[PDB]
Design a protein around this ligand. Sequence first.
Ligand code: PMP
Ligand code: PMP
Ligand code: CA
Ligand code: CA
Ligand code: CA
Ligand code: CA
Lengths: 396, 407
Amino acid sequence: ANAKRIEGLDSNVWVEFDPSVVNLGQGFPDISPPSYVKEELSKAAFIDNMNQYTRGFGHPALVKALSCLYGKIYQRQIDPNEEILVAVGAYGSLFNSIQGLVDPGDEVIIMVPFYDCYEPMVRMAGAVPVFIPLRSKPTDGMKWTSSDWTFDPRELESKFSSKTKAIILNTPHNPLGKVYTRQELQVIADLCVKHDTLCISDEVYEWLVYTGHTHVKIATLPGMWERTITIGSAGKTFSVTGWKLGWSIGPAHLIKHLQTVQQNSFYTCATPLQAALAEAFWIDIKRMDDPECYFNSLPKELEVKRDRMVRLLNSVGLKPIVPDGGYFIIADVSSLEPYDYKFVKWMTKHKKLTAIPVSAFCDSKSKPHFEKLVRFCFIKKDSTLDAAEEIFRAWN
Amino acid sequence: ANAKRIEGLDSNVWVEFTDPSVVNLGQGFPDISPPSYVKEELSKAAFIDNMNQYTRGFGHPALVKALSCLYGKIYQRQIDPNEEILVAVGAYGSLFNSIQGLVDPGDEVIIMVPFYDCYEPMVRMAGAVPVFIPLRSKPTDGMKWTSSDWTFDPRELESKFSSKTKAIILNTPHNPLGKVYTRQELQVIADLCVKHDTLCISDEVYEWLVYTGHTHVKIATLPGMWERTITIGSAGKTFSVTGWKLGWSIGPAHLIKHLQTVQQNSFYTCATPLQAALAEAFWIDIKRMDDPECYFNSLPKELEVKRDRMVRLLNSVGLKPIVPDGGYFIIADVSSLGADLSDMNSDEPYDYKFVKWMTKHKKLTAIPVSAFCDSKSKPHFEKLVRFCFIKKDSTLDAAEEIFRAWN
Ligand SMILES: Cc1ncc(COP(=O)(O)O)c(CN)c1O
Ligand SMILES: Cc1ncc(COP(=O)(O)O)c(CN)c1O
Ligand SMILES: [Ca+2]
Ligand SMILES: [Ca+2]
Ligand SMILES: [Ca+2]
Ligand SMILES: [Ca+2]
């Protein structure tokens, strides 16, 4: 018998989803992590102290590294102890944020399609998710891209009331690949300031922005530092999704409440992973300048792979939406229980290729508007994408 | 402002407890080496690319398979790795899953005092009402003071159960007392849980650390209890790697699913390389469970020696130790020292003053037992200080130097 708070929250999209099938579904990198990330974990393993309890809110060496890296991005001095919290992934950071800040009866605005945990997390806190969809614009004629999706500022305004506690922002966006523009962020900022709401900004894909786009942090916009929690992830930054380390960065008067959730929930994150992650950070922080920096080299490597996926999807009559950022690409499926779920089962069984139906990232009323869209992951090794080529070449 | 569910829960004893020349017998920080193979296995896992990516949400398959094998032997029943186990971020996370998945606002949860400090705020964050009952000492055998001289009154316990009781939290072996609950004590608890149809959440992280004359009994193995108990263990304790932060909840499928629902909506998955390495460590020791060199046997054997040394050290200065049946903490009554605390003028309990004094004057820290007590219980336990002995010989040598030079 569940507690009331988790009523109806037991179904989970990922819980629902053959070894000759090429999996382009889940965000499971099969490229290697950088060699030094692995080496540093090995080194921490052999130090006895690095196997025992560390500082609860974050390993001192790690919060110092994050302080120094993010202080450069933000152009401010970030207090490593008071303005940072290390949690169990971005998931954990998100949970800390909602649990510590959002009351039963609060409204939380979510942009659709949304990364799927946003909705049940808001609901577990007894809050009301208030949905607004991203919508299409006329294309430049040439190609379909993430930047051809935006939101209507007037519709957004109408979502804000005196019940609104916060808006959840995700840039670069999953599943669309949208890198939100400065002007878009400014509309969100104006409304958070005018209504005095929080912004929770999920920026795990922050390094993964392609040619002609720039990651901009809403927390750097005038008046936003004081009302924003910005979230990062080791799993994305260093392609080690299995390390489950993320962080929240923001003002002390907000971070302390995340800290209260953490000390009362899981308390401490793993010492060896955090020690190794601190060293991985120092290596790359010292060479941000250079194309060898993993912050530089990975987006560069992935852009090639993105462009590859777009050719392959085109090659078979699937209309790709070229992503500004991240490592997912959506394809419209229409020119070949919701449509995209049926299509994905059909493509698995008959083409030996798997993907994720976009309707999984949509509230019930929005699903008809997105149900002909399917998402593919390209943070894959050359050999994996060749196996995918084979499947596409052989499709007809 | 904070969310309402966390009002007044921002204070934390461990945060409150913050110098290189101080000998630290306070926090449960092991400075013995963990087993060599535990460290080896994490290194091995680090170099496998796959073991650095997402694994199964509710627990890495090899880990839960190892857990089901080991606990199947202990429970003498088949344990389902997927449906009857949930791997969480430490025993903390397991406790959190349990209370968050199973306990409603207005529910009562019975807690035994002193209690591992997190029990109280976890119950309050869920909007539930902690109902406290103290452990009470009884006359000693004359020669020694032990954990076994502490117990609860069964009639007092009974009176805490009402139609509003959702659960009782059991911690055995007990922190901070070191008490190993007897079959008869567990039987009293089981009787009431069955009579009122309540849950039992049983924190058994120290399950392997039981000393001569005592045996770890799992309440969930008693008649009627399997269907109503969540039993919690921890890698930090099992393998002396407190920094790995992996624990597990074991119980019936209809209860574990609720815990699994909290986890999927909170942090989701635990780290892959730690879980992979831990599985291997378990196999290495599962396969030699009958042998002295099994870590499950050698660690309590090694700790029993250290415990006895600590008892002697505390005695030499006039501290009155409570010899623990289990775990790696020891409590001493400090009141026969009548210490020079005259002018530390706060409204803090005696034991916190004593510890501050001991740290400054004697260069030795410990933990005040009142940190493990609710407001009304503090005066009944405030002359008691907790010392940790999961320590290497050289650390206890340093401690011994201080005790010898004490007067
Ligand atoms: C937008 C978004 N946020 C959060 C997460 C979870 O991050 P973590 O693995 O660090 O918990 C993911 C998973 N790839 C994601 O796509
Ligand atoms: C009784 C008890 N329960 C739970 C914990 C926390 O366990 P973990 O470190 O596995 O989260 C501790 C701390 N050692 C403890 O003493
Ligand atoms: Ca307002
Ligand atoms: Ca308050
Ligand atoms: Ca079975
Ligand atoms: Ca009842």
